[PDB]
């Protein structure tokens, strides 16, 4: 029974992170675009179980699962310990320092924590 990570992966200024695959249990918020709410009485998130389980659906006012009338900000994910994300600077920035640039959500003595990536992107 996979454990959810209490926090988001470390945030690295000007950096984005991506998972190469998702582990049994990651959850994906069924978020909607502006002017669109989720279908009445509709599921809140998809769950990785291998494949995804529920179905998002937005009306109007595991591998990377396929879109729906999604959100233009991103997908709000919930990872489980053991999960790893990979970091890379966005466009317009280069890796100044390149200490480890990936993170694993580990559960050291009770609480969960992500490994601190050491990536730095300057203008």
């Amino acid at each position: 029974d996979p454990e959810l990570c209490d926090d988001d992966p470390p945030e690295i200024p000007h950096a984005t992170f991506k998972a190469m695959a998702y582990k049994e249990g990651t959850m994906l918020n069924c978020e909607c675009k502006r002017g669109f709410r989720r279908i009445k009485s509709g599921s809140l998130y998809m769950l990785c179980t291998s494949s995804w389980d529920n179905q998002c659906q937005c009306t109007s006012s595991c591998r990377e699962p396929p879109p729906w009338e999604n959100e233009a900000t991103e997908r709000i994910y919930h990872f489980v310990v053991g999960q790893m994300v990979y970091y890379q600077c966005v466009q317009g920035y280069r890796a100044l320092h390149r200490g480890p640039a990936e993170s694993v959500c580990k559960m050291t003595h009770g609480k969960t924590r992500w490994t601190q990536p050491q990536l730095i992107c300057t203008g």
Partner: protein, 121 residues
């Protein structure tokens, strides 16, 4: 009977209160996670008929609880609600034009219940 309705409303508010207090505390590390889900509530809930919107959001409530017996608590809740507003769609909850976290969602309904109980006087 005014007392039946009051009782039901009290039982209902206590269960909601149990969930709110049960997840909204410093001993729950999943909180932040739970606060990312957008919940829908009535802009101005005041009539017992509005309990339709709480009903339409129960499976979602049971779902967030899985991140925290939910299956039994929500079942109890759902029945009480039906007992308070029937089996017919009592309101067209196209909801508020605004969303909410489980903390707000629950705050609304707990306040709704406490209010109607006193109003029943």
């Amino acid at each position: 009977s005014t007392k039946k309705t009051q009782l039901q409303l009290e039982h209902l508010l206590l269960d909601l209160q149990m969930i709110l207090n049960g997840i909204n505390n410093y001993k729950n590390p999943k909180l932040t996670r739970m606060l990312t889900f957008k919940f829908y509530m009535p802009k101005k809930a005041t009539e017992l008929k509005h309990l339709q919107c709480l009903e339409e959001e129960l499976k979602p409530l049971e779902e967030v609880l899985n991140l925290a017996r939910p299956r039994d608590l929500i079942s109890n809740i759902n029945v009480i609600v039906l007992e308070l507003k029937g089996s017919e769609t009592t309101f067209m909850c196209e909801y508020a034009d605004e969303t909410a976290t489980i903390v707000e969602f629950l705050n609304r309904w707990i306040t709704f219940c406490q209010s109607i109980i006193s109003t029943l006087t």
